[PDB]
Amino acid sequence: SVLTMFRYAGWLDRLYMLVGTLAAIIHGVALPLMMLIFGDMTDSFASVGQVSKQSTQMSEADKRAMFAKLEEEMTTYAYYYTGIGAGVLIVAYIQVSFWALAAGRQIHKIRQKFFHAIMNQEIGWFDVHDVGELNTRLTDDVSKINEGIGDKIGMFFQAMATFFGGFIIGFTRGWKLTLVILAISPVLGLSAGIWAKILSSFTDKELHAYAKAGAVAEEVLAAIRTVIAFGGQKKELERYNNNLEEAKRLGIKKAITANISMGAAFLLIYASYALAFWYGTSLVISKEYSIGQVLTVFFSVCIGAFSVGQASPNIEAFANARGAAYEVFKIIDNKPSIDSFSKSGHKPDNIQGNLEFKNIHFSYPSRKEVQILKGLNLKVKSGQTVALVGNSGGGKSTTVQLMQRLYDPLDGMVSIDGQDIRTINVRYLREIIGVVSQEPVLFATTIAENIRYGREDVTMDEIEKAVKEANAYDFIMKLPHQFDTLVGERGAQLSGGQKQRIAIARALVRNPKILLLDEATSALDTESEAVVQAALDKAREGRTTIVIAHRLSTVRNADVIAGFDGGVIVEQGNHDELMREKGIYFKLVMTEDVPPASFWRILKLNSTEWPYFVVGIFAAIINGGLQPAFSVIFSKVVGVFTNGGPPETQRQNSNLFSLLFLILGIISFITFFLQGFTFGKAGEILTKRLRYMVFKSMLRQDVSWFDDPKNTTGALTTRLANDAAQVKGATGSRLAVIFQNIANLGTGIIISLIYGWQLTLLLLAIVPIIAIAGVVEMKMLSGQALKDKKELEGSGKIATEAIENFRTVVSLTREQKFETMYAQSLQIPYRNAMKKAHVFGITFSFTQAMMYFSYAAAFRFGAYLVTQQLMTFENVLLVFSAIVFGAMAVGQVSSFAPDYAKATVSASHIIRIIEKTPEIDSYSTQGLKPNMLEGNVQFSGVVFNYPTRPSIPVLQGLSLEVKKGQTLALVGSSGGGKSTVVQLLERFYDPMAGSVFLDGKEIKQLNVQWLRAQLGIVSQEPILFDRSIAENIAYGDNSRVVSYEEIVRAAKEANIHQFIDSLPDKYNTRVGDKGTQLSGGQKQRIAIARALVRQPHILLLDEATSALDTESEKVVQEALDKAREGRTVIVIAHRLSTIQNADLIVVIQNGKVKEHGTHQQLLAQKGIYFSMVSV
């Protein structure tokens, strides 16, 4: 459970990690080797020259002799530096590349395995758990695992080796002066382990909070139309901000932990080698050792602070990866009982289609304490049609869901041909069944691709036959792009009847032996339903079919009618057989350019955090300049140490040095904590602010923006989770250490200018060489990051669509198809990662090699400077010591380039989305707010074309009127434009030509929120939230807090209060995602209650009683009649029972008013209205 990641490594990855780790140990010992020949050899030679100095004795010959002696040695050391840098180029490329390649391969495998496990889970698991969290994790937690298993591990092995290599060199050059450091090393490791565990624990909770926020974002962006209709933008933003705040607090805790860890590490190493300083100096003045502090061993153990400071962030990244892997691998390791990928089961060759339910007891996992089916008995003979009738919530859809083995009954057996379906192969069982859900769901692709989900190997002739049987051929052939025309998410860019007929065809292409029809004709008009029913009855003999129809005309022709009452079959028989019993059936039939200043503009939104940046930059300057100043202070200490007079009096300086290194350690602790913490807190504030502003801007947009193919729910959620994380990757501790290293380089340059002005030219020469490689690398990485961000949204779209439509995906047995699509969508990012591995490796290797080439050049040039009597040897050594730290700082800065490109791209996109302004702005306080509404709605010659299919005319000209106390009934064929009128009255879109009036005022001159607050709308396919029944009902009026009594009154008006009260947890019963844990009629009634809680002046009913039963719709209609006068109501209905009482009926055909008048007038006249009610 600790190396749970690295689970999917294989032979090649294990070799990349060993060879990369071998290179990292070889890379790490180059710097100690640089100190070895600089310290042990040259400093000793210089001291011997000063110690064995005879003043002006044979000066003319001796000066030249010693100058040549040191110059030859320095040239040889320059050659050694060149040789070390030559191998540094290879070892550094391997260290970085090999660890990046292994990380990329492992992350690819982890993503594929995670998506496979999510698709392999069960329907009950999906009901119990939340799924927007899964969608957010698949991106964010996988990226977090990636940032901790890659080249940062190689960077840890490299600094660990520098620390140890320095220790080993010190041990070789002196005894017992490094055992003190080696004894405190375990304390440092223990501290590292403790704070790594703390940070991993914090990361787990922070990712939980981010997943909770992403779930809210996903639900809101999937129900954006309901959110906009009910003015819920402000409450949905508040819900998102609630989780953003928890994530921000956890991130601040993470920053405190990590930065106090870094500060404690620096304090501990400083105190540890300060004790060594004191003890060793006491023993050296005791003459136990001669040279232990003279620039050899104290300069070998000086790089330990740099090593620890460089190793700590990689430990933090590893801890974050461990925290991220928890939930991912928990989901991966979860195994389902009803496994749809197992090959363990029977696959009968010839199935005659006999279905039997024997004593079925079932209760849902989400509500165990509610019994749905209690001893259900049902037999379906071969090639027979059986109709399930009864009141809503009776378990009719539960029977269909059990027939597909989405759940297992708690008692009893479901069997096919006398064989238990539990022993049949699950994939085979689901493949021999075609099912149409109560409210069908499509996918964001073309019509032909949607139909191919039923059967992949289907041909175009078979598709045409299926859409002829589904009565969709004419509607598809009247479209541009015909079968290749692209539908929206869930089929949103099609009308209800068209979307349902597409699903009917998708079921038909499977050639199913068992056909499950669940309210398959709810959204179909009577004319289309007739031909669909004829087509179904033309091929009934080949298969056995179960139909759940509220339309009772289709029930009459069924072979056997089953009746549901109290979770059992009360009356089973034919039409006349049940007419004999005159029971339930009788009662029922009785009536771009990525600008370079994007990252600076995103940092101006942190202007309120300027005091945090000031102190952080000051602390970064202090601790960055401390590193080069160490050489100067050590050189000054050497002066008071080489000859202090009496050996015993040296104890004063001995205790002075311990105080110096202890105060220095305290200062390092304080400054490192400040530098990390202030920048981290500013970054945590910035991340939350950016996420908040992006979500608010997304909620501000128009419906046409969400209708775009590139703005799907998955793409939007991926954008939300990704743009903030990429910007965060270049802020905080990274941006702090960037300033730290810049101040380090500046301090080195300044002391070089003060002491030797010649080597400053070498520094100003090495800077551009690293700079050019950095800029070309950043150019390549940004160029590829644009496409990486473009392609990641597609994979997010695939994952979100599969997870949100998991029930349909499982019914169609299309898990493997979506896995293939996800894998294919991962291809371009994977290859870009593989190429970035080599690019980053080669750039890092070039930078590191240039560092050692600069060291060699500095040595060679200092040789000439000393030869020409320009610079003293001690000054040359001091400036070279500065140059080493400066070059390391420059390389560390260059290592920040990969993050900055992604940050710039994401910052540009964030700026663009934030600054975007819609046309129909709902956040605008401008517009008229009439003080008196009379409920007069007039459409005056409205011409409208949808933005996604602008070539198609929807409404050629539309003129209808309605006043207070009147009901306007919209009738017509599917796709006529009835639901477009509702969306135009809701100001979802503006008409191309024409006008819509409210009490004589143009609705474009009104306030958008004010106008929407006067409308009560229930959509054709109502959508709820994964919240309580009470929250869903109270969502109708988001301006005020709705009382419990008012919620109960609305529920009673909607004829749902009895069900809610007879249910455990009552009104606090959490509804499923989109209302899936309710019956269809129950969800429709909850939406009716949500609409009625407003007491709206205009009531918009769009097939508001499609999922209801006869008694329920009668009660709802009586309530509407009781609240009829005093409000304007527009009704879209197919049933004659909801049109008879309408004041005026308008027949809209082809987006025009064809027939108008009262029911009596339209029935007396002969035409479309008379034809539609023939039977």
Pick the binder of ligand Y01 from 44, 71, 73, 75 (CB under 6 A). Answer: 75
Q: Which is nearer to ligand ATP, 270 or 407 (CB)?
A: 407
The first and second tokens of residue 939, run together, are: 């459409």
Q: Which is nearer to ligand Y01, 87 or 957 (CB)?
A: 87
What character string, x for contact with ligand Y01 (CB under 6 A) and - otherwise, covers 731-770?
Answer: -------------------------------x--xx--x-
Pick the binder of Mg ion from 166, 1022, 1036, 1080 (CB under 5 A). Answer: 1080
Q: Which does 445 bind (CB under 5 to 8 A by kind): ligand Y01, Mg ion, ligand ATP, none?
A: none
Q: Binders of ligand Y01 among 180-219, rule CB under 6 A?
A: 185, 188-189, 192-193, 196-197
Pick the binder of ligand Y01 from 31, 34, 36, 78 (CB under 6 A). Answer: 78
Cα(1149)–Cα(1168) distance, rounded to whole angstroms? 9
1149 contributes a contact to ligand ATP by CB under 6 A: no
Instruction: Return the half-sphere exposure (C-beta side, CA atoms, 13 A cut-off) of residue 93.
Output: 11
419-434 burial by CB neighbour count: b if 16+ within 10 A, else e?
Answer: eebeebbbbbbbbbbb
Count of residues that interact with ligand ATP, criterion CB under 6 A: 45
78-104 burial by CB neighbour count: b if 16+ within 10 A, else e?
Answer: bebbbebbeebbebbbbbbbbbbbbbb
95 contributes a contact to Mg ion by CB under 5 A: no
932 contributes a contact to ligand Y01 by CB under 6 A: no
Q: Which is nearer to ligand ATP, 158 or 498 (CB)?
A: 498
CB 307 within 8 A of CB 160: yes
- In the complex, least distance from residue 481 CB atom to ligand ATP, rounded to whole angstroms: 12
Cα(817)–Cα(806) distance, rounded to whole angstroms? 12
496 contributes a contact to ligand ATP by CB under 6 A: yes
- In the complex, least distance from residue 254 CB atom to ligand Y01, rounded to whole angstroms: 15
User: What amino acid occupies position 405?
Assistant: R
The first and second tokens of residue 908, run together, are: 């540009």
Instruction: Return the half-sphere exposure (C-beta side, CA atoms, 13 A cut-off) of residue 1093.
Output: 29
User: What amino acid occupies position 619?
Assistant: A
What character string, x for contact with Mg ion (CB under 5 A) and - otherwise, covers 1005-1034?
Answer: ---------------x--------------
470 contributes a contact to ligand ATP by CB under 6 A: no
- In the complex, least distance from residue 197 CB atom to ligand Y01, rounded to whole angstroms: 5
The first and second tokens of residue 118, run together, are: 């999510």
The first and second tokens of residue 1058, run together, are: 């009895």
Q: Which is nearer to ligand ATP, 902 or 978 (CB)?
A: 978
- Among left, alpha and beta (phi > 0; psi -120 to 50; other), residue 522 is alpha
User: What amino acid occupies position 353?
Assistant: G
Residue 214 makes CB contacts below 8 A (sequence gap 6+) with 132, 133, 135, 136, 140, 717, 720, 721
Q: Binders of ligand ATP among 1062-1121, rule CB under 6 A?
A: 1072, 1076-1082, 1107
Residue 1100 makes CB contacts below 8 A (sequence gap 6+) with 982, 985, 986, 1015, 1016, 1017, 1018, 1091, 1129, 1130
User: What amino acid occupies position 533?
Assistant: Q
Q: Which does 398 bind (CB under 5 to 8 A by kind): ligand Y01, Mg ion, ligand ATP, none?
A: ligand ATP
- In the complex, least distance from residue 310 CB atom to ligand ATP, rounded to whole angstroms: 53
CB atoms within 10 A of CB 831: 12
Which among 512-520, 543-551, 856-864, 899-907 is the span making contact with ligand Y01, rule CB under 6 A?
A: 856-864
The first and second tokens of residue 734, run together, are: 């990274």
Q: Which does 864 bind (CB under 5 to 8 A by kind): ligand ATP, ligand Y01, Mg ion, none?
A: ligand Y01
CB 547 within 8 A of CB 517: yes
Strand-pair partners of 1153: 1148
860 contributes a contact to ligand Y01 by CB under 6 A: yes
Across the beta sheet with 967-971, the strand order is 1015-1018, 1098-1102, 1128-1132, 967-971, 1144-1149, 1152-1157
By residue count, the chain amounts to: 1175
Pick the binder of ligand ATP from 178, 293, 493, 526 (CB under 6 A). Answer: 493
178 contributes a contact to ligand Y01 by CB under 6 A: no
Count of residues that interact with ligand Y01, criterion CB under 6 A: 55
Give the C-alpha distances (Å, rounded to integers) separating 397 from 294, 392, 402, 507, 562: 86, 10, 9, 17, 13
Residue of 1114, 1060, 1103 lying closest to 1082 (CA atoms) = 1060
Strand-pair partners of 453: none
804 contributes a contact to ligand ATP by CB under 6 A: no
Which among 59-67, 149-157, 644-652, 988-996 is the span making contact with ligand Y01, rule CB under 6 A?
A: 149-157
Cα(1125)–Cα(262) distance, rounded to whole angstroms? 73
Q: Which is nearer to ligand ATP, 455 or 1135 (CB)?
A: 1135
Residue of 497, 488, 501, 498 lying closest to 947 (CA atoms) = 488
Pick the binder of ligand ATP from 707, 788, 986, 1113 (CB under 6 A). Answer: 707
Which among 183-191, 204-212, 309-317, 393-401 is the span making contact with ligand ATP, rule CB under 6 A?
A: 393-401
Q: Which does 854 bind (CB under 5 to 8 A by kind): ligand Y01, Mg ion, ligand ATP, none?
A: ligand Y01
Which among 506-514, 578-586, 873-881, 973-981 is the span making contact with ligand ATP, rule CB under 6 A?
A: 973-981
What character string, x for contact with ligand Y01 (CB under 6 A) and - otherwise, covers 316-355?
Answer: --x-------------------------------------
Q: Which is nearer to Mg ion, 9 or 504 (CB)?
A: 504
What character string, x for contact with ligand Y01 (CB under 6 A) and - otherwise, covers 281-320?
Answer: ---------------------------x-----xx--x--
247 contributes a contact to ligand Y01 by CB under 6 A: no
- In the complex, least distance from residue 683 CB atom to ligand Y01, rounded to whole angstroms: 22
For the purposes of burial, counting CB atoms within 10 Å of the CB of 659, is it exposed (0-12), middle (13-18) or buried (19 or more)? exposed
- In the complex, least distance from residue 326 CB atom to ligand Y01, rounded to whole angstroms: 8
CB atoms within 10 A of CB 744: 28
Q: Binders of Mg ion among 978-1007, rule CB under 5 A?
A: 979
User: What amino acid occupies position 910?
Assistant: I
Q: Which does 22 bind (CB under 5 to 8 A by kind): Mg ion, ligand Y01, ligand ATP, none?
A: ligand Y01
Residue 7 makes CB contacts below 8 A (sequence gap 6+) with 329
Interaxial angle between packed helices 132-146 and 759-804, expressed in degrees from 0 to 180 and rounded to the nearest 10 = 150
Pick the binder of ligand ATP from 312, 717, 752, 974 (CB under 6 A). Answer: 974
- In the complex, least distance from residue 569 CB atom to Mg ion, rounded to whole angstroms: 17
User: What amino acid occupies position 1139?
Assistant: I
Which among 138-146, 432-440, 530-538, 987-995 is the span making contact with Mg ion, rule CB under 5 A?
A: 432-440
CB 875 within 8 A of CB 858: no
**DSSP assignment, residue 565?**
S
Q: Binders of ligand ATP among 402-441, rule CB under 6 A?
A: 438
156 contributes a contact to ligand Y01 by CB under 6 A: yes
Q: Which residues make up the interface to ligand Y01 (CB under 6 A)? A: 1-3, 6-7, 9, 12, 15, 17, 19, 21-23, 25-26, 75, 78-79, 82, 90-91, 94, 101, 152-153, 156-157, 160-161, 163-164, 185, 188-189, 192-193, 196-197, 308, 314-315, 318, 762, 765-766, 769, 834, 850, 853-854, 856-857, 860-861, 864
Residues that bind Mg ion (CB under 5 A): 397, 438, 495-496, 979, 1020, 1080
Give the interface with ligand ATP as residue ranges (CB under 6 A).
Answer: 127, 364, 366-367, 372, 392-398, 438, 488, 492-498, 523, 548, 707, 946, 948-949, 954, 974-980, 1020, 1072, 1076-1082, 1107
